[PDB]
Design a protein around this ligand. Structure first.
Ligand SMILES: N#Cc1c(N)ncnc1-c1cnn(Cc2ccc(F)c(F)c2)c1
Length: 295
């Protein structure tokens, strides 16, 4: 019999994830079905989103050769029935206070920083780049978390050194670019561009660097359709563009500039969005989501 979630202590919540204490050395990492758009957590959950993204993350952990925080199988008996398929048993680490970001393409705050200063996180880039420009090699563009409502703050390598030490900072940079490069090449082979990605790392008892949280999900990474990649314009979000289009379209009744909470999504948009998550997962993993564990 699986334990109840209420047997564990809630220790953290994010926009679309939760974290629980299992015992002194283990946590339960939980993905929810909530979806964020335009910095709002939407009223409408996406069915199976937590399970699909957990399946995605498990696939990528398996693809990468680096140490990670997984501490048991996806069906580990310590996982409650209620979150089965969308929760992982992980080992407790001393987390490093750095959002480790790799960018293979120039968009978002990376693009904005470049347009303002000609540089991103200390990297002075060539002139003449623009929206969705390819970056070669990929850039380590670290960030720090700010207050609850605020976006992460982009910082340079010196700031990372100041946070975790000189040798550790080099390690974070090197590993972030190495595993991004591997995952991005794999995804592109399958027809999906991973334009960028965000990791957190922790340290175990022996001082080893360990990859944590969720990895290479559409929440942690921008997924683009490679078949429609067109430098110079904003790329469609592989997973969220239906949601985005409806909210900012003539049927929502919502003004994005209002900064007021957006309305609930049409059921049809939520179902279509679920289909996009499954498509992305099955294309990248080569597996069937129908085989992924659930309640
Ligand atoms: N993963 C992991 C982990 C670990 N293996 N050992 C120690 N601490 C962490 C840990 C602590 N915070 N976070 C970020 C995070 C995740 C999920 C949430 F819901 C959330 F609010 C905040 C990760």
């Amino acid at each position: 019999m699986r334990p109840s979630l209420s047997d564990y202590q809630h220790v953290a919540s994010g926009k679309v994830r939760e974290l629980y204490r299992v015992d002194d050395e283990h946590l339960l990492f939980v993905a929810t079905d909530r979806i964020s758009a335009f910095d709002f957590v939407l009223d409408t959950p996406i069915p199976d989103k937590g399970r699909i993204l957990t399946a995605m993350s498990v696939f990528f952990f398996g693809l990468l050769t680096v140490p990670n925080h997984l501490a048991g199988p996806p069906d580990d008996p310590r996982i409650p029935e209620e979150v089965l398929g969308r929760a992982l048993l992980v080992r407790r680490l001393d987390m490093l206070p750095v959002e480790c970001v790799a960018r293979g393409y120039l968009t978002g705050s990376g693009l904005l920083d470049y347009q303002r200063t000609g540089a991103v996180c200390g990297h002075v880039l060539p002139q003449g780049l623009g929206e969705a420009s390819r970056l070669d090699p990929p850039l380590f563009t670290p960030a720090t978390k700010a207050d609850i409502g605020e976006h992460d703050m982009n910082v340079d390598f010196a700031a990372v050194v100041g946070l975790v030490g000189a040798v550790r900072a080099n390690q974070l940079r090197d590993e972030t670019i190495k595993i991004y490069t591997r995952a991005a090449a794999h995804a592109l082979h399958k027809g999906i561009i991973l334009a960028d990605t965000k990791f957190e790392f922790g340290v175990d008892i022996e001082g080893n660097l360990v990859l944590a949280d969720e990895v290479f999900t559409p929440d942690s990474s921008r997924y683009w359709d490679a078949a429609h990649y067109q430098p110079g314009v904003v790329q469609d979000s592989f997973d969220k563009q239906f949601v985005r289009n409806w909210l900012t379209g003539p049927e929502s009744g919502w003004d994005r500039a209002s900064d007021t909470p957006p309305p609930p999504l049409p059921d049809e948009v939520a179902v279509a969005t679920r289909e996009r998550y499954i498509e992305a997962y099955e294309r990248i993993s080569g597996l069937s989501f129908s085989d992924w564990i659930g309640p």
